[PDB]
Symmetry: D2
Subunit: 309 residues, 4 copies
Amino acid sequence: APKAKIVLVGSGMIGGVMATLIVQKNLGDVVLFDIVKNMPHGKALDTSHTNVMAYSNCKVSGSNTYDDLAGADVVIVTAGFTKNRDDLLPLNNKIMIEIGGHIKKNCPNAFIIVVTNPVDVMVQLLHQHSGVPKNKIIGLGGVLDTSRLKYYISQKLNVCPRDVNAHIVGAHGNKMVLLKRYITVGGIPLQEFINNKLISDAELEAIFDRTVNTALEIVNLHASPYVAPAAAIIEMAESYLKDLKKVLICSTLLEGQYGHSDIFGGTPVVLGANGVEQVIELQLNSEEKAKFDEAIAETKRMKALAHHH
Amino acid sequence: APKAKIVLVGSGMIGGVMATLIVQKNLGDVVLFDIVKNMPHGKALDTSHTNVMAYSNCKVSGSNTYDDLAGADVVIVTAGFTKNRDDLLPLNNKIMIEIGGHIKKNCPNAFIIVVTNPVDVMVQLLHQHSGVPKNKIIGLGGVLDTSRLKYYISQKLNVCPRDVNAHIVGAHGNKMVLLKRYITVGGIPLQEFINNKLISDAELEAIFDRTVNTALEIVNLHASPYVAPAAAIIEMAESYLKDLKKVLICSTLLEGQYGHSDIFGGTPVVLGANGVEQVIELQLNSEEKAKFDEAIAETKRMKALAHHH
Amino acid sequence: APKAKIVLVGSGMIGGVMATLIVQKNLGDVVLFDIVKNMPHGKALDTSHTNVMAYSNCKVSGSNTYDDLAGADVVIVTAGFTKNRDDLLPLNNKIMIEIGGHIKKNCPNAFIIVVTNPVDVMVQLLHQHSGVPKNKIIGLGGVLDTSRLKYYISQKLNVCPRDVNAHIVGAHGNKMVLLKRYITVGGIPLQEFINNKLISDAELEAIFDRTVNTALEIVNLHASPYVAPAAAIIEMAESYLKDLKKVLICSTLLEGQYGHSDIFGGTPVVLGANGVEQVIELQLNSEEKAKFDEAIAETKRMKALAHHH
Amino acid sequence: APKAKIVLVGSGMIGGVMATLIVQKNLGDVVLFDIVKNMPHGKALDTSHTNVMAYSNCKVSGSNTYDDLAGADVVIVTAGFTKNRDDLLPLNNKIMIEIGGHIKKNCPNAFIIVVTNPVDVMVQLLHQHSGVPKNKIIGLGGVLDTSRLKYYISQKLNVCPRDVNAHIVGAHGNKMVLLKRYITVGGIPLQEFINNKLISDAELEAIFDRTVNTALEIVNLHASPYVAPAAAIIEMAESYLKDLKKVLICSTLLEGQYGHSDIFGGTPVVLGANGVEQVIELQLNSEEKAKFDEAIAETKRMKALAHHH
Ligand SMILES: O=C(O)c1ccc2cc(C(=O)O)ccc2c1
Ligand SMILES: O=C(O)c1ccc2cc(C(=O)O)ccc2c1
Ligand SMILES: O=C(O)c1ccc2cc(C(=O)O)ccc2c1
Ligand SMILES: O=C(O)c1ccc2cc(C(=O)O)ccc2c1
């Protein structure tokens, strides 16, 4: 069938939520790939039954074989060690190299979404080893980080969460750049709401800090924050598959935007049938650019540690 | 059942699309009311069958009896003469009076959406004769007019239509106030896109004029523009019914916003379970306010003609 | 884009509902084609704005040019005279011939759904003149006629309409074959509900007659029954486009099923990415077959009148 | 707000998928309750962010306080020990007693769905201690077990999974009664497909055995089968909340159906705004009844072990 084939390279906790959401949305056939024996087949089996409840017809199959990447339209990479964090960098580089080789051989035309931490480094490593065009590979970041910021502001203002829009750029992770100037509520500048004393600057500062620290907050509450990451990835994948042309903030190859080249960073892009159809460069002021620069420097620092043991 | 009961007072072309969309969305039971004998029952019958295709369970029934307003949770008023246009004003005032009397008697707790042209006048007339609280009655305008502006800009910029946000205020109709300053694309100020020569000021001026004249453009093409009006109304009704708290631009009672009282005008409001939960006042500059004032003056001019023959 | 292109050949009342539903469901780009100047462009314009309300990105464009069939993935034919009814048969044959020639030239790989009355005749005429494979062209019938039967029974039994399943075969129109034996409720034989005195044989007979006469009932109520037809067609088109492999009763070329060849008739088929993937032959008894035979005879009678003036 | 409040009593793996699906479907506000400190708040936080991606507005909050059951419209009970299995029976009885006391005090009008193994026993225990009417409490079973049977047959026959309908009754668990006679495909008796050699009796026997053993199969593949259970529960909860009146097989109080009283067993019921609106008794033959009797006997055997230590 001409249904899309979506291969999840990595079938951990985020993988299972992604599979669930693909079936809910009838987005395409799913392969849960993982190096762990049996487990992806078990999760695939469980998930496949939900086709009945969902009125969908998506195959869900497990795989321990890289060659099942053949014919993939979308590949989502979450595989990688997670337990210095910097020590994992050369190990995960090797994983990106291996995965990239298989993409080059089996599905060179696939659209690739990378998630493996640190994403802004790992996406570029996979880009270089997979050989795919710059418009066909992106990293998770801004959709996820802004979902937090948007959500927290929406609860304060008592409006629909999607009606808050916001931009976090540069990198996923602790050096993410939260741009106060680019927040809107129902399309209205947030500053109007500050002027009206519906929300204060001090509240926003606390919300900014909460946003940066959210993954840590959930971990400290004895949960693992994989559900929102899954939903953000599926929003990205869906925009590609359905040619929605949504503006979504993702990690993409910079070719001079923000004064930066030869590196991936978080910025609004337009995702449609041709992949990254547009890279949007926010017209940052010097103070915002300085923070963007710090985010890029940290990506570069980690990229340098990733190459050798 | 505690399913919502949605009464469409007026079962013309817009009524049938509204009924169709309510069933698609399984939003509640529908009554198609109209003074015309038989026709609403026929349209109700046809529409009811789509429950099967939609996996829905919404009753659709016709009515020639006002007392079927009893128990309505939402009432959508499209009834009124349409063929000077000013001569119809006293006739339609009488229709609002009659409908308001029946709302007061049969469904005083209902949330009311008025559509009858000119909406910013007719909504206030129905408010006064129905006796409903100011937070429980609104008029169509801004959702519809901005759908045009958003759509036209989205096709120019090749982005998802919903990713363009915009504000048109004051009134529905030819004095609508298009606010260039409040347009965004993926939450980014439109001016950044003008700066980048992705869209020009001259293109936007042509798009503004096209927006104002769109209903006329479609009429001149030998069609009747009732589909987008239907969808805009259902977006409003849905936000109420599901407590979405969307920011949607609607006609609402002004109590000093923009310097205006004792009149309805178009402005962003938040629609949820308590009706109009918030009236948002845009911080307009003097030039924008002047245009808002012209829109209000025209509503007042027509309101004055509506009372007597 | 690899979005599907869906061409509606005929932009009358059913066309506008079809366009509306395609945008609601984000199913693909739409062309409203019609020989009438301007009107399809006006309806396309109106419908296009609903992308905003629907969170969709489907182009809707009008057309007065047959060559805009180029690249069509799905073609829905509703064009044809409607006002003896038999006198229209040779006129509509000419319309099918013209449309078939354009399909052969411009979109030979398209999946075709015919609606033009009488559908079981017109579908075969278009099949023969378009040259498309037998698995790539079907006619509306059973989805629409059974939606009525399913709906009426569901209201009697107070169950979800989709939970009633039923089969009407042979032909669309007054010789449709309603099969009492093949009705189920939640997958349970209807006879169990008759045994339990939840519904009587006499009620079902009245419901059968109502089903056959439903289009006439709605016309006699001074409405035009185009909404359910639109929804049935879109359910068919969607099953194809999304490779759902739904079992849906449609008019298809019979190659010996029910003892009949060289004619189209209503029967359950499976619709997916390869079009008509399976033709399901119900194991009818002799009494049911006799009624099927009458339906085929009437199609053949009209087919014979269609060729010459 | 009059949004529904849905309390998940138990915030384990199934709880998190349930929360995810409620937000996807915008079904209501969610409370993740659990005796484990902090964890439900962490999962609630993560899940809440998906409102942005989903265009929803459902609150998701954690709770370690039983009194947060107050105002619940739906309560889903998954809490209970899981690691003889019979030894857990008196422990889980105590958990049902505690939970029932809190339901009686805080939300006596709530609709209750029980999941705790063994469900057909635990549902009755909670019924007796909560005091809720028999139409307001059900147990998971048939929706889940039939999703497997439907799915496996649909893959064999290459049809849409929802187009296969089937009945498994008596009890959830190893004594479940699979009824070959009540399987249909597109509403057609499965026997027609056996007659046609599209599927064999021997294949169906293997599929029956696979269905009974599916949870064990997934466990043996080193996964945990909680995703399909979550989706089945949400289909049940949704039918109630939206008054869909779906026919869904659930555990319910038998008052003479199948010759059985004073016990809960799996049977088709209709779920709508009044809860269990209809209990449907399949007209089983003596051989099917004998298997139903074995399922009831096993529920009774375990119910007897549950009371005392
Ligand atoms: O599968 C998991 O266990 C898992 C857990 C947490 C995650 C967080 C992020 C993130 O914050 O970028 C991305 C992916 C994740 C995957
Ligand atoms: O039912 C109809 O025939 C009809 C036609 C056009 C309309 C336009 C508007 C609008 O532009 O506000 C609102 C309602 C309408 C209703
Ligand atoms: O566009 C219209 O005006 C129109 C009206 C009625 C219809 C009925 C059927 C049907 O019953 O097969 C099919 C198509 C129709 C189209
Ligand atoms: O939360 C979990 O870990 C969990 C795992 C398996 C389950 C199986 C069933 C089932 O087969 O009835 C019901 C609930 C479950 C919950």
